[PDB]
Symmetry: C2
Subunit: 421 residues, 2 copies
């Protein structure tokens, strides 16, 4: 219920990166100039993600949850509709900026007001349902996207990023006061209140115990965090965020659409190609909950780095072999083979270990930095890499990242495997 209506927001993360997948689909007749400053177009977008997400947690420390999350819904309608129009260097750089601050802000403030309204004991396989909600986000994203046939129409679909944002305006219009914000800030009244607003009186002395212990323990042991062994280990989870986001899907979907153009002369395969790619990825973000439990905590992510390195190997081969068309129908096949691997390990499973890895001591400042660095990753990707997809007639992409499947596989086996068997 209430959960699926916030899931419309996780979904919003989905449609946002799926309509810039679609923005790297429909770009050229909106006059980008060029794939390089499209690199800087998406660079602008995820920069917004960074100063926005950097600015997320602490701006939340100043002003509280409710009107904040609302303010961000407002930023979403505002931004999406602002980029429902395109004029100059200004509104491209700028529009991308505001929408990005909105994205970073979004996925950063979901789980904390989710922690305040929903008990700490609820973050599980249903939160993973929030992740595959991001995924179906991709579904209707590119679906609607190609489903429109000319120029002002995907700007119009930024407006159709507004329609949900205004029901995501409405999505946060409805919440009573911010409960665990109250619980930490000594105003505990309205906390205890919404707490009885929904589930009736039984377990809340112990759930009060639980989340008050998460904010009071984070507030107790953030004392040793700024500097060493915690700090160093976290910059390993940062270099992890790096080796992880670097053979990585965000920008990968952007130029998935982009060479769904730069390969094949007419876009019907930007529909069976894009919506196929992602229907597969929903299928896969769904096998998520299966294989977090099912397979293991290592050989899966290894196998992911592997199958990546493979579909990138053959695919790059068909690429230089001058066979860019066979490398295209097979681009579907190869890079979607790759898609099935991104899905079977390194989206959810890696993460499930990641908070499972630290002591129960702290989360927010730390994991939020691994965040900043991770985004940092995405950004270098989107910036730089669409630029050498334009020129080389490129064999280089998938090889450089098979060796990134390799140095993040080096990451894999000297850092989070277990050697034997």
């Amino acid at each position: 219920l209430i959960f699926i209506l916030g899931a419309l927001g996780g979904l919003l993360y989905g449609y946002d990166n799926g309509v810039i997948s679609g923005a790297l689909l429909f770009i050229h007749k909106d006059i980008p100039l060029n794939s390089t400053t499209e690199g800087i177009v998406v660079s602008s977008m995820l920069i917004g993600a960074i100063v926005g997400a950097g600015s997320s947690g602490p701006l939340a420390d100043k002003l509280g949850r409710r009107r904040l999350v609302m303010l961000i819904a407002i930023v979403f309608i505002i931004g999406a509709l602002i980029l429902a129009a395109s004029t100059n260097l200004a509104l491209l750089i700028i529009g991308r900026l505001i929408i990005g601050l909105a994205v970073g802000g979004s996925m950063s403030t979901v789980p904390v007001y989710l922690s305040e309204m929903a008990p700490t004991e609820y973050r599980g396989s249903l939160g993973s349902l929030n992740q595959l909600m991001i995924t179906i986000g991709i579904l209707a994203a590119y679906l609607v996207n190609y489903a429109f046939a000319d120029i002002e129409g995907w700007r119009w679909m930024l407006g159709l990023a507004v329609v949900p944002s205004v029901i995501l305006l409405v999505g946060i219009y409805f919440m009573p006061e911010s409960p665990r914000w109250l619980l930490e800030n000594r105003n505990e009244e309205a906390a205890r209140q919404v707490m009885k607003i929904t589930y009736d009186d039984s377990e809340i002395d112990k759930e009060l115990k639980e989340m008050k212990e998460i904010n009071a323990i984070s507030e107790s042991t953030w004392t040793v965090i700024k500097s060493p062994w915690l700090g160093r280990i976290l910059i390993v989870g940062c270099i992890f965020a790096i080796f992880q986001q670097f053979i990585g899907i965000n920008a990968v979907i952007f130029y998935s659409s982009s060479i769904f153009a730069k390969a094949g002369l007419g876009e019907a395969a930007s529909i069976l190609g894009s919506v196929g790619i992602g229907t597969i990825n929903v299928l896969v973000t769904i096998v998520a909950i299966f294989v977090v439990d099912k397979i293991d905590r290592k050989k899966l992510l290894v196998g992911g780095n592997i199958g990546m390195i493979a579909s990138l190997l053959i695919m790059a081969i068909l690429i230089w072999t001058i066979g860019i068309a066979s490398s295209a129908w097979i681009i579907i096949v190869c890079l979607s083979l790759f898609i099935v691997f991104f899905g079977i390990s390194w989206g959810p499973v890696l993460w499930v270990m990641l908070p499972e890895l630290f002591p129960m001591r702290a989360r927010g400042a730390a994991t939020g930095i691994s965040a900043l660095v991770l985004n940092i990753g995405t950004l270098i990707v989107s910036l730089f890499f669409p630029i050498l997809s334009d020129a080389l007639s490129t064999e280089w992409v998938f090889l450089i990242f098979a060796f990134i499947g390799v140095l993040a596989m080096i990451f894999v086996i000297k850092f989070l495997p277990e050697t034997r068997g």
Copy 2:
């Protein structure tokens, strides 16, 4: 038991390569110094194989076919009981040599002697039956090699190499004069009426016809052969024969009894590893009885060497991570793959495609010469490659052999057309 003891000529043949398998398991206890001389020794095998294989045919046109197949089986008794003792490296050089000459005699002579004494209605897909019995010869070869628990006992089993060496001989013991040898060389009386004894005179009008017709148009077409454009197609049927052995198990077999024990740490995995893997070979060869016709030959050479390079790299990074207790376990494995993709594809399929390439009417000079260049490949792998095994701790064979299955991935859709149509 005609084509059963003849195919026992096949099984002897492969059994020589497996012989060196249980060998590359027991090497260092025989007075070797060192793995390099192992290289020059299976080299010596395949050099005896080289002169023994070319001079099969012209010698067969000088002193006859019957005496020739017989003579070769005896080259088997000589080379094998010779190869059944040891003092210093000499009997290894000259032994693997004579043993070699007989083997070359097998591949070059025996299916054509089966071509004389049996109508031109057989040596095809049941010549592929001969293929089945040889992979049992190989499989059972190093199977028994590593069943015998000591060196003087597998020497006991090179005398036991003389055993099947003389049964094909027995297979040719009671045998009469060579029928199509008569049929082209003007002695044909016995040819016509042997064509009478074997298969009963109904189609042998059309078959005595088919082979005196092809004997005829061979008498007409061996002249426009040896120089350009036809020499261009033979040059590349020989590059066919080289990306047939630079990618293959004619190293990996014996030196996989080497890697299942000398990597695999105990030869336990030389029986389960090497023989077990050999039965995986047999599995995919039954798969070869059936998969001739339906999907493609070209694109499974494709997926084949594709997957060659799959396990080629996998092996490779599985090793640079230096996990070799567990990297060997996954190496019976990795192998099982390379052997399985080689199995779906280029052990049999390239070899049937050389008759499916060059004219119906002119075959022999070009396919036997393609075989000469073939063996050049095999022996290059023999000498050069296992000598590197005492050297670099290698990502490097199968990262190399990856690149081999690689330009073996590029030369396919760059050159090869498809043969079904």
